[PDB]
Amino acid sequence: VRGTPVRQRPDLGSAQKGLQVDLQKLVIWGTDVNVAACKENFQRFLQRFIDPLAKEEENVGIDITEPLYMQRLGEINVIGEPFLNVNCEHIKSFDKNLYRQLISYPQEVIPTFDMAVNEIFFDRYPDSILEHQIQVRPFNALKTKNMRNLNPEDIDQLITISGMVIRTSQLIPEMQEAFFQCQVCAHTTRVEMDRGRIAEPSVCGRCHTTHSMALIHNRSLFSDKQMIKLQESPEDMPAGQTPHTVILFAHNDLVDKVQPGDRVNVTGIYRAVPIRVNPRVSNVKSVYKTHIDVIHYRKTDAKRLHGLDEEAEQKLFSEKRVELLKELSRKPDIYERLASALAPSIYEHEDIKKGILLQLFGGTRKDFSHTGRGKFRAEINILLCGDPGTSKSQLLQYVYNLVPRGQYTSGKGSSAVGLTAYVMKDPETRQLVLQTGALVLSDNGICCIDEFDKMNESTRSVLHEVMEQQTLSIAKAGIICQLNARTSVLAAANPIESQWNPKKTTIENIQLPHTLLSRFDLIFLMLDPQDEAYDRRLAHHLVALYYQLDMAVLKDYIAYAHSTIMPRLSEEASQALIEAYVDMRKIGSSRGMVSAYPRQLESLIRLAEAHAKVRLSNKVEAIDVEEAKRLHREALKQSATDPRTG
Amino acid sequence: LKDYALEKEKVKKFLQEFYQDDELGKKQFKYGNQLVRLAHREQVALYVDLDDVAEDDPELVDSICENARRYAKLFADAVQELLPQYKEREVVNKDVLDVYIEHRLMMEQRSRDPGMVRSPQNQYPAELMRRFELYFQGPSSNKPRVIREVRADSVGKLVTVRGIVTRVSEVKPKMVVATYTCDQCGAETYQPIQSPTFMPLIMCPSQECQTNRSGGRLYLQTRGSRFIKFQEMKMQEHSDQVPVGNIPRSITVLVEGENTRIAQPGDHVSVTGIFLPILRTGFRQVVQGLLSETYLEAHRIVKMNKSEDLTREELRQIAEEDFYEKLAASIAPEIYGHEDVKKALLLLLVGGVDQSPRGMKIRGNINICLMGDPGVAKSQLLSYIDRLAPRSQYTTGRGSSGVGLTAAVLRDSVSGELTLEGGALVLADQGVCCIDEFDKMAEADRTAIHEVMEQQTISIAKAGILTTLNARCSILAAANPQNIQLPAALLSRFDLLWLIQDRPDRDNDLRLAQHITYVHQHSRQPPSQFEPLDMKLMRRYIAMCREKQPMVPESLADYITAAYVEMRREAWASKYTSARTLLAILRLSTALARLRMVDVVEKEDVNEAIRLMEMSKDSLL
Amino acid sequence: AGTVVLDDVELREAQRDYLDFLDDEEDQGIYQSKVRELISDNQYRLIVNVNDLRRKNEKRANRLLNNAFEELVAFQRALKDFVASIDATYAKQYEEFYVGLEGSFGSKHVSPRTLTSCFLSCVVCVEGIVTKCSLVRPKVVRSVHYCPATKKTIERRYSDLTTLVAFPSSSVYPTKDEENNPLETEYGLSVYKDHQTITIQEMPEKAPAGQLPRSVDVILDDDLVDKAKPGDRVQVVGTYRCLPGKKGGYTSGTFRTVLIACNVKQM
Amino acid sequence: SGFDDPGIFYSDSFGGGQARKSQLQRRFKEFLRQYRVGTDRTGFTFKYRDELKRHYNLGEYWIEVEMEDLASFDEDLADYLYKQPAEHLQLLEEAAKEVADEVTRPRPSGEEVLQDIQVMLKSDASPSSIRSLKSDMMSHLVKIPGIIIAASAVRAKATRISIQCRSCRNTLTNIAMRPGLEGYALPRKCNTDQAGRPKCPLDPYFIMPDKCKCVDFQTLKLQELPDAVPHGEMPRHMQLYCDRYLCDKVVPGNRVTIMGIYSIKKFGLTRDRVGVGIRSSYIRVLGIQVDTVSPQEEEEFRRLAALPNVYEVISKSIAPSIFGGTDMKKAIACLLFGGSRKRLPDGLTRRGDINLLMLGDPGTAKSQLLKFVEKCSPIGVYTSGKGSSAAGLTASVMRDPSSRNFIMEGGAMVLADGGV
Ligand SMILES: Nc1ncnc2c1ncn2[C@@H]1O[C@H](COP(=O)(O)OP(=O)(O)O)[C@@H](O)[C@H]1O
Ligand SMILES: Nc1ncnc2c1ncn2[C@@H]1O[C@H](COP(=O)(O)OP(=O)(O)O)[C@@H](O)[C@H]1O
Ligand SMILES: [Mg+2]
Ligand SMILES: [Mg+2]
Ligand SMILES: [Zn+2]
Ligand SMILES: [Zn+2]
Ligand SMILES: [Zn+2]
């Protein structure tokens, strides 16, 4: 302590009695924690804990020799943010009993950790100024593979779960310190919140008038709060169990930190609270409901790609990692290496994998506001038109499980309202609220539409606006707005009759309106060549799956590309693009082929920019535009189709 | 009337001096050992068998069956009184509630003053310091009752019913004893909750606050309180026991403690418990009187008759090489012929091994579609598979359509929330979904089935529902007629598409007619050389096979590749085959190896898989 | 119908003990002879020696002398049962039989000056001089009514709530039928019991010379009404109780104490 | 499941300038347990502990505390009991009950219910004049001298009551009545309406008499001391309320010192009496001190009588200051010791009391001898042939027409029964 104001911890709930009980050492009532011992143990953990298996890439700006969290405290000194994220795994490795005490008694233990961190920090720094005393965030607790298995025995304990955010309610203010003024002499007093309630003065302390003191709402002190409806991603999925929605609650710093559709590991206290029979009576129900007072949000995932927030953050890569990635870029076959890395167990779909990689990398974001032109879609859209059993669904699922902010819909399982938005009755505030859809939840990510042909036009019409202007203009009875839907669409289509007739042309087989097909800036025909070598090697691969680049480098490469690569058209690439579009239109003028409109010049620009980004060039080049030409041409099998027939 | 102190002594005597030879013929104190366990806190639920009780005290059994709640409490109190004398060491404090109980007992001893008499309300409640729970197991002499017949005349009795579980809430914490802590004295207050609702207390009645005449506002909190795993399920009559024209009747079953997470929707269960009322105040009662709800408090839940949760004879039967054919012929013994069809159905019931190579799942489920003319027993086969498989949902054309196959959203009662209820596919999540009239099934339903086949999931993006379900089921479709109707859509997906054409033939028709007429004569198939296995045995063998994952040795790689390439050449020459067919080969061979109960698949399994595949293929021609 | 009592362990034990005490054939036979005597004499009160009761059963003696009301109720139920056993035709004549006490009362033998709050609900024996002797008024315990319009006949039962909480519904005397027809009370069929109130004063010779007298109010029900007159010296044995006041939202702690005589004997 | 309702259980208060009432009650309990009287030479005893034990065993259920002892052991407790006697007196009463229970805990059957322990108090401080009872001493502890000129009969004041609702018959047992002259306003609404939707009436409660814990209470009329009344004045008066074991402790005529709470009647704040804000004052009595044989004395009497010349020593000792009359003095000793009262089998009686007459000249000290005999006799009244002023000679009995009670006006003969 150095005079810093110790801010309250609304996440830890209303303070309890805190009854000390001597066992004859001096535990807290109902627990086996003694404040002195817990504080000393955590102080020791901070002073001297080193991670032996830590990696320079895992920890950036952290020496694997010096104690871990002392450097974190140094960072908190350098910046103003007085928060310290402490790994429950590290605590378990250091002092296992300390970990068990933390997990079983979070409300009691965590304040001791706060005291210890404040003591150490203010001893080291007698002059650093912080708005409030540092606060400790314990995360990475042993993952709860399914909330449905948690039991009343686990209530009020620190758990950790994973899931995507479905909704985030508005900022709810919470009282912390009521302000009272006398209606006679104007005497002012303050009453801090105590155990989840406030005691009215009932008598003036200056004029002694009974009940002359009135509460001043807008002169009181409040704290932020926010309901967050999150959908659980249970690793353990027992038979017959439907998906799970769990109510979260953020407090005063986690409010509005995770948007809908974001996937997060949330560590927090598992609370059970009563249900009033009516919102007006105080009678409660014998059966409680449960929610999560969120202590920590973690975005990083091992099996996914870097999120938007992580990419935005400056210190995401060490200088060594940056140099390694730049070397990998200067490598000449980086494009094919990354394409092969994508979906490692999908056999030689080189062109489709390259297209999906370009989709992941994405073009450049352009600010055409000054031009009065509108908003240009930098995202790339792909349509895999193929016979059932051609692995298009497998590729769709791989992308869905790979990309952050990914949504998945199939066939007639969706609807226009369910994809765009709708109005429901939030069954915790009894208020009517607006719930997004898949196309919005995937706003800055990907939507995977399997069975893209069984999508009766009523809902397929919605995709026009999304794929053209990245906007979803909803004008319903009460709510008018335009939601950002800057998604990338990966769709899978089956030729009519579920089989590709080798007599009808490309368009006649696809059976999708040109208005829509011109939106997709890549269309891959997954067609089966009756080839001995292909069949034999495919059988070898499929059997090999029955008995036996790094994701890390791929993820880091994509993150760095998005972070600091903004390819710009060069003059030579511009002329090449002009010639490419004229030639492509000339070719597409054929009868049954996929005709090329200026949307296809836009598509070529997008693909060239994506390839330049893959190369980290920062300047789109004739090589990139030529590769875009080649990819768009091999897709649809233009080379293998005559300008008359298919 | 009866003296409940004498009854408590009787139950103590039984619980202490009852012995049985269950443990490998050696005499054992069946309940004494359990008492030792749950005094050490190694066991939670104590299931008193009323057959055991009746073995020496029939009158106690009658009294329990007449006033089960009273005797339930008597047994629980007897157990609690006996625990200290059966404890043989110190518990390791496995639970925070155990920590609370330890502290409470230690402080009561510290402030004991043994000679002093404390007020009846100045004591810890019984339920607050139990950490165990006593249930019954209905006497076998009590014939199970029908949910329809369980009426007001049997309230408070102990009854057992059987039916299909339709709706089951999730497990949520139900307050049993609310604990409050004062802000003046530092004592605790305990409110044992019995009604569905309670009004939290405001003023602390502790002696210190009563003497001080201070405020004594107490704070309800969950830390020191006593919750119990709670669930509420709906249990539905069985079709055979419903009256002529009525619909099946439902009953509400309240499950507590360790009985939770036993049953799931779609299970055939038998529940034994007490028929108890809930007071029905709050409404504007049209008719005067103390009307009340009705429910069964779950004491014993037993999955039965489709999903029940070894011997040298069965080991030898497995060791027999013709065990595969034995099981096949046992599948629907009444149905004459269709030997390869039944073998394919057995392979379906077994299933292949699931694969997870580098971030993508190749499910081991087997998909079979029975195309055939009218009256070739496709419906009978699907119904039999539904009765046989553990988690089986048999869906006809359109009665179960839309949300009848996919999940919907319904308002809750315990929480009043919107809960997601699964459809037929989810109810058969990890079993068999027998789709009948798949050709005539709706387009949305057909697309949902296609999606579940391709992904084992069900994505929904409608208004009230936005979820990605999980349905890892095996589809057994039975359509009727490219011959005359042979969609490439079905061909590209179904791993085994079987055509069942019944061309007239004097000899075969006469044999089938004799089979049918003997069946109608004797309610059973004609006697054969091999007696067909009983459904219980078939389920046991199939279940044991399921957990026998056999791998594919690299030696068979070239053999499989050669067979696949040969089939590709044949299909190309003729007037459909692909990687889906190759995966069908792989999983059928794996399932055959699993049936043989080996760890490595063999050329015999591969050959049998190819043979069944070729039979299916040339059934088209 | 209301909350009846199914089984009562204490009441059953008390009635069994009292019936055993009253049944004397294996013993000398004193109380069997006394019951036969009262049957012959056509009475409905038995005088039971507290000394004999204490001799045969100490616990019943202590219970009877310390909690008299319910104990006397059980004793009288046992007495009626025993009288029915001896001869039911006579037991049917009288609705109830009463149990007066006699003999020696150790600390329950007090004077009106010594009859303090400590003896409330106990059996006490007080010897004193009668000062006041009110008139013998009939108190209706069962009233018969007749409705000339509907020809119906009704019976209203009033419980002896002299010392118990009484609510107006109990004491409502009916005058109109359900449909406001006039009801005529049939005096020849109703049932009344003689009731009297007397006052017992500390004997002038035994009282302290200096101070003023002390007196106690005594209620005598049927069979004990004209046993004493003013100026007589008498021994009254009965329960010392508290009389309820009247309905009121406010009350002082004061209560009016009386003695419901169970037997009265001449000096 | 919504039919039954268990009570509300609670535990002990484990854990945790003004001192809480529980703390002060604990200090009173420790004062009762650990007050030591005596010396190491003569040993030590716990006066209040042993007094509580003996009284409870004998069946008393009351003790007397010394204010000097209380102030010596814990001065703050004494100051509290003086300034706010009522609440602290109740604290002391409950502490006494607890100490009595824990010192007599192994009680025999029957006598199991712990009884309430009244705590009278006395002090060695000089009493204060009744006329000093100003308004600054209201509600305080006051010690005053007076003379009791009346004493009402002992009646029953309820300490606990059980009130039952007329509609649902539910009870509100054990309502703690306040001590002294004060009433209780019954609840107007049956709070137990949750057991059924149809509601109970307004003002539904009837007091159940048989469920009342009553105690003895008495009213006395204290009059100022005649030697305290100023010359030309009236005797001031006061009303005394006496409790369980203060009832009949004093009788009319006794000159007493009363230690009690100066309190006003509190019965509901509701031609003559033109004043406003005036309520009947009275003193709630806590301790009464009435103002004016051990084995050692037993053996003393034995030896003194065993002396040879006991007759001579007694005769010369009775009236030492009167000259001569030795025969009369011996006769006076014989009169004082009396003969032997006898009753023969037939029932007749022979008196054992001697009758002496002293005719003589007026100069002699006959009146002085009579005065000494009256002063020395255990029970002796000195009067005249025509009775005395406001006191007759023999006894008369008169029936009061209103109350019908026979008031027995006792003369000298009946006042000196078993005496002289
Ligand atoms: N192969 C067979 N063996 C025995 N019974 C059969 C056979 N085929 C048809 N049946 C009988 O004919 C009736 C119609 O069979 P069903 O299951 O409806 O055929 P489908 O599936 O073609 O509708 C059933 O009652 C069934 O018992
Ligand atoms: N024998 C005596 N010795 C001492 N004093 C005496 C004697 N006789 C009389 N006196 C004194 O004279 C007073 C007059 O006597 P008194 O008591 O009036 O007797 P009485 O009037 O009955 O003859 C007494 O009060 C006493 O003090
Ligand atoms: Mg059919
Ligand atoms: Mg004279
Ligand atoms: Zn003021
Ligand atoms: Zn309290
Ligand atoms: Zn009521």
From Swiss-Prot, chain A:
GO terms for molecular function: ATP binding; ATP hydrolysis activity; DNA helicase activity; single-stranded DNA binding. Belongs to the MCM family. Residues 334-543 form the MCM domain. It is found in: Nucleus; Chromosome. GO terms for biological process: DNA replication; DNA strand elongation involved in DNA replication; double-strand break repair via break-induced replication; mitotic DNA replication initiation; regulation of DNA-templated DNA replication initiation. Acts as a component of the MCM2-7 complex (MCM complex) which is the replicative helicase essential for 'once per cell cycle' DNA replication initiation and elongation in eukaryotic cells. Core component of CDC45-MCM-GINS (CMG) helicase, the molecular machine that unwinds template DNA during replication, and around which the replisome is built. Early fractionation of eukaryotic MCM proteins yielded a variety of dimeric, trimeric and tetrameric complexes with unclear biological significance. Specifically a MCM467 subcomplex is shown to have in vitro helicase activity which is inhibited by the MCM2 subunit. The MCM2-7 hexamer is the proposed physiological active complex. It catalyses: ATP + H2O = ADP + phosphate + H(+). The modification N6-acetyllysine is found at K96, K326. Its main location: nucleus. The lineage of its organism: Eukaryota, Metazoa, Chordata, Craniata, Vertebrata. Its EC number is 3.6.4.12. One of its GO terms (cellular component) is chromosome, telomeric region. The modification Phosphoserine is found at S14. ATP 2 binds at Y347, K392, S393, N494. ATP 1 binds at R373, R519, R599, E602. The chain holds residues 107 to 779 of 863 of the full protein. It is an enzyme of class 3 (hydrolase). A motif (Arginine finger) lies at residues 518-521. The modification Phosphothreonine is found at T4.
From Swiss-Prot, chain B:
Early fractionation of eukaryotic MCM proteins yielded a variety of dimeric, trimeric and tetrameric complexes with unclear biological significance. Specifically a MCM467 subcomplex is shown to have in vitro helicase activity which is inhibited by the MCM2 subunit. The MCM2-7 hexamer is the proposed physiological active complex. This is DNA replication licensing factor MCM7. PANTHER family: DNA REPLICATION LICENSING FACTOR MCM FAMILY MEMBER, DNA REPLICATION LICENSING FACTOR MCM7. Belongs to the MCM family. It is found in: Nucleus; Chromosome. ATP 2 binds at R493, R580. Its main location: nucleus. GO terms for molecular function: ATP binding; ATP hydrolysis activity; DNA helicase activity; single-stranded DNA binding. Acts as a component of the MCM2-7 complex (MCM complex) which is the replicative helicase essential for 'once per cell cycle' DNA replication initiation and elongation in eukaryotic cells. Core component of CDC45-MCM-GINS (CMG) helicase, the molecular machine that unwinds template DNA during replication, and around which the replisome is built. It comes from Homo sapiens. InterPro entries: AAA+_ATPase, MCM, MCM7, MCM_CS, MCM_dom, MCM_lid, MCM_N, MCM_OB. Residues 500-543 are annotated as: Interaction with RAD17. It catalyses: ATP + H2O = ADP + phosphate + H(+). SMART domains: AAA, MCM. The modification Phosphoserine is found at S119, S356. Residues 323-517 form the MCM domain. ATP 1 binds at Y336, G375, A377, K378, S379, N480. Transmembrane segments: none annotated. Its EC number is 3.6.4.12. Pfam families: HTH_MCM7 (PF24901), MCM (PF00493), MCM_lid (PF17855), MCM_N (PF14551), MCM_OB (PF17207).
UniProtKB/Swiss-Prot annotation, chain C:
Acetylated by MCM3AP. GO terms for biological process: DNA replication initiation; DNA strand elongation involved in DNA replication; double-strand break repair via break-induced replication; mitotic DNA replication initiation; regulation of DNA-templated DNA replication initiation. GO terms for cellular component: alpha DNA polymerase:primase complex; chromosome, telomeric region; CMG complex; MCM complex; membrane; nucleoplasm; nucleus; perinuclear region of cytoplasm. The modification Phosphoserine is found at S159. The modification N-acetylalanine is found at A1. Its main location: nucleus. One of its GO terms (molecular function) is helicase activity. Coiled coil: none annotated. Keywords: Acetylation, ATP-binding, Cell cycle, Chromosome, DNA replication, DNA-binding, Glycoprotein, Helicase, Hydrolase, Nucleotide-binding, Nucleus, Phosphoprotein. It comes from the Eukaryota. Belongs to the MCM family. Acts as a component of the MCM2-7 complex (MCM complex) which is the replicative helicase essential for 'once per cell cycle' DNA replication initiation and elongation in eukaryotic cells. Core component of CDC45-MCM-GINS (CMG) helicase, the molecular machine that unwinds template DNA during replication, and around which the replisome is built. Early fractionation of eukaryotic MCM proteins yielded a variety of dimeric, trimeric and tetrameric complexes with unclear biological significance. The MCM2-7 hexamer is the proposed physiological active complex. This is DNA replication licensing factor MCM3. It comes from Homo sapiens.
Swiss-Prot record, chain D:
It catalyses: ATP + H2O = ADP + phosphate + H(+). ADP binds at R350. Keywords: Acetylation, ATP-binding, Cell cycle, Chromosome, Disease variant, DNA replication, DNA-binding, Dwarfism, Helicase, Hydrolase, Nucleotide-binding, Nucleus, Phosphoprotein. GO terms for molecular function: ATP binding; ATP hydrolysis activity; DNA replication origin binding; helicase activity; single-stranded DNA binding. It comes from the Eukaryota. Signal peptide: none annotated. The modification N6-acetyllysine is found at K371, K375. GO terms for cellular component: chromosome, telomeric region; CMG complex; MCM complex; membrane; nucleoplasm; nucleus. Disulfide bonds: none annotated. It is an enzyme of class 3 (hydrolase). GO terms for biological process: DNA replication; DNA replication initiation; double-strand break repair via break-induced replication; regulation of DNA-templated DNA replication initiation. The modification Phosphoserine is found at S294. It is found in: Nucleus; Chromosome. Its EC number is 3.6.4.12. The keyword Transferase does not apply. Its main location: nucleus. The modification N-acetylserine is found at S1. Early fractionation of eukaryotic MCM proteins yielded a variety of dimeric, trimeric and tetrameric complexes with unclear biological significance. The MCM2-7 hexamer is the proposed physiological active complex. Belongs to the MCM family. Acts as a component of the MCM2-7 complex (MCM complex) which is the replicative helicase essential for 'once per cell cycle' DNA replication initiation and elongation in eukaryotic cells. Core component of CDC45-MCM-GINS (CMG) helicase, the molecular machine that unwinds template DNA during replication, and around which the replisome is built. The chain holds residues 2 to 441 of 734 of the full protein.
